[PDB]
Design a protein around this ligand. Structure first.
Ligand SMILES: COCC(=O)NCc1nc2ccccc2[nH]1
Ligand SMILES: COCC(=O)NCc1nc2ccccc2[nH]1
Lengths: 179, 245
């Protein structure tokens, strides 16, 4: 088993912390949802290859431009997150997060991940966003942003129901293993 | 960590740690507040444990088994004794607040109503000056420690054997040298998230809401000061590269 490093980036409301918690426990917390994530080393077997994938969160580092890049050394794969219920989190991807990740992690694959996909057809979400002349992020807008930023791929998931969560981390492992 | 504290913080939450008959005696909002305070103390216990792995397992093991050049162990683990003194003292205060709150006849049933004052004390005066000085130094030596570690692991056989030996047990899975360094660096930016969520469930007593509001402000001031005082040190960097920053 080779050791690989994954770091998740994105706005504070993108759901990166919850995604790491649900994947690491293979469960959406039934009693208490933790505020923070420390680290984890997941044992993953993808396409017959065994990998120990270390997982890191950047939550709490968004306002600290000299502390935040300390999370990047030797990263093998980046998960760049946005929330499907927040078109503002998608707008911050191309010229805030993308230039930063390309600078500190040159040539590292980026997977653009649309989190909270369960809220795309949520009536409360659609009513709230319509007050700001907005709507939940469409799959094609996600794919186009991923294409634009030179992402390795585009994926969607829901930490709430677990749908798509395993597939995201299995694909991140595949990306980390590429030349 | 010592067994008594590990057992006190074994459950996933305060609501799962206390007896169900004691849990039933509290309102929903108090349970939500206590679950977040329990996460703050449990993650502090784990952070102090990360610092003990660095000082006792790694640093002391290298000094007593390996023949590294002078100034090499200090370069790998900058400010570890100062960091361990700051956080062990803060952990002691948190665990004493929990202990004083225990019901007579119980070693698990408690409610902490007055955390704000403890957090104001930790994040103000000489203790905040020491945290700011220590993290500004540690975080500025982060890149240098990682690079020194990689050089030694790839060129020194006895160093590689030592590392593979002490990190082999399953309980060290998340705690290799570079992982401990990043866990420590990321610790300070976890405090605002935890303090803000505790504040969200502490509106019942206005003095407590005000104290946590002051503490959140102090932690953010500390973080801004540390972030502004960081400049990555680089072995062999020339003065010209530095003054042309
Ligand atoms: C949404 O999760 C998909 C997945 O594959 N998670 C990995 C995973 N599986 C685990 C089993 C037991 C304990 C911890 C675990 N962690
Ligand atoms: C579904 O389980 C019922 C329950 O009692 N959960 C505990 C609990 N719920 C919380 C919400 C916010 C903060 C902290 C909390 N802690």
């Amino acid at each position: 088993a080779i050791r690989k490093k994954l770091v998740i980036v994105g706005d504070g409301a993108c759901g990166k912390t919850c995604l790491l918690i649900v994947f690491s426990k293979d469960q959406f917390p039934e009693v208490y949802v933790p505020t923070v994530f420390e680290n984890y080393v997941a044992d993953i077997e993808v396409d017959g290859k065994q990998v120990e994938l270390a997982l890191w969160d950047t939550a709490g580092q968004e306002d600290y431009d000299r502390l935040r890049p300390l999370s990047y050394p030797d990263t093998d794969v980046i998960l760049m997150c946005f929330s499907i219920d927040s078109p503002d989190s998608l707008e911050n991807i191309p010229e805030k997060w993308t230039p930063e990740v390309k600078h500190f992690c040159p040539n590292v694959p980026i997977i653009l991940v649309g989190n909270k996909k369960d809220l795309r057809n949520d009536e409360h979400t659609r009513r709230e966003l319509a007050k700001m002349k907005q709507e939940p992020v469409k799959p094609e807008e996600g794919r186009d942003m991923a294409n634009r930023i030179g992402a390795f791929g585009y994926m969607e998931c829901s930490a709430k129901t677990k749908d798509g969560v395993r597939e995201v981390f299995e694909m991140a492992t595949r990306a980390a293993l590429q030349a | 960590s010592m067994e008594m504290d590990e057992k006190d913080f074994a459950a996933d939450s305060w609501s799962l740690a206390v007896d169900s008959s004691f849990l039933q005696q509290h309102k929903k909002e108090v349970m939500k507040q206590q679950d977040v305070i329990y996460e703050l103390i449990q993650t502090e216990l784990h952070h102090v444990r990360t610092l003990k792995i660095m000082t006792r397992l790694f640093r002391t093991g290298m000094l007593e088994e390996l023949h590294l050049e002078p100034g090499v162990v200090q370069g790998l683990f900058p400010c570890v004794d100062e960091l361990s003194d700051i956080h062990t003292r803060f952990l002691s205060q948190l665990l004493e607040r929990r202990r004083q709150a225990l019901c007579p006849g119980s070693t698990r049933n408690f409610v902490i109503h007055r955390l704000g004052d403890l957090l104001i004390s930790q994040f103000s005066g000489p203790s905040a000056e020491q945290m700011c000085k220590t993290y500004s130094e540690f975080c500025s030596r982060h890149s240098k420690a990682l690079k020194l570690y990689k050089e030694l692991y790839a060129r020194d056989k006895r160093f590689q054997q030592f590392i593979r030996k002490v990190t082999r047990p399953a309980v060290l899975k998340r705690h290799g040298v570079q992982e401990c360094i990043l866990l420590v660096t990321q610790r300070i930016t976890k405090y605002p998230l935890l303090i803000s969520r505790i504040l969200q469930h502490s509106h019942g007593i206005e003095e407590e809401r005000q104290d946590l509001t002051t503490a959140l402000g102090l932690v953010k001031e500390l973080l801004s000061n540390v972030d502004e005082g960081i400049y990555q040190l680089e072995k062999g960097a020339r003065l010209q590269e530095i003054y042309n920053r």
